[PDB]
Predict the structure of Capsid protein.
Amino acid sequence: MENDPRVRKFASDGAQWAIKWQKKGWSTLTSRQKQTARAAMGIKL
């Protein structure tokens, strides 16, 4: 995942985590944001 469409949907929804994850890079989220993301995106990473 570099710019996944799911991430774009959330970022368009106003999901700050996805907005950051997509644009600023997946590094820029904290564990809680990534963890929130894992729930929405179904991510195991």
Q: What stands out?
A: Residues 5-41 form one domain.
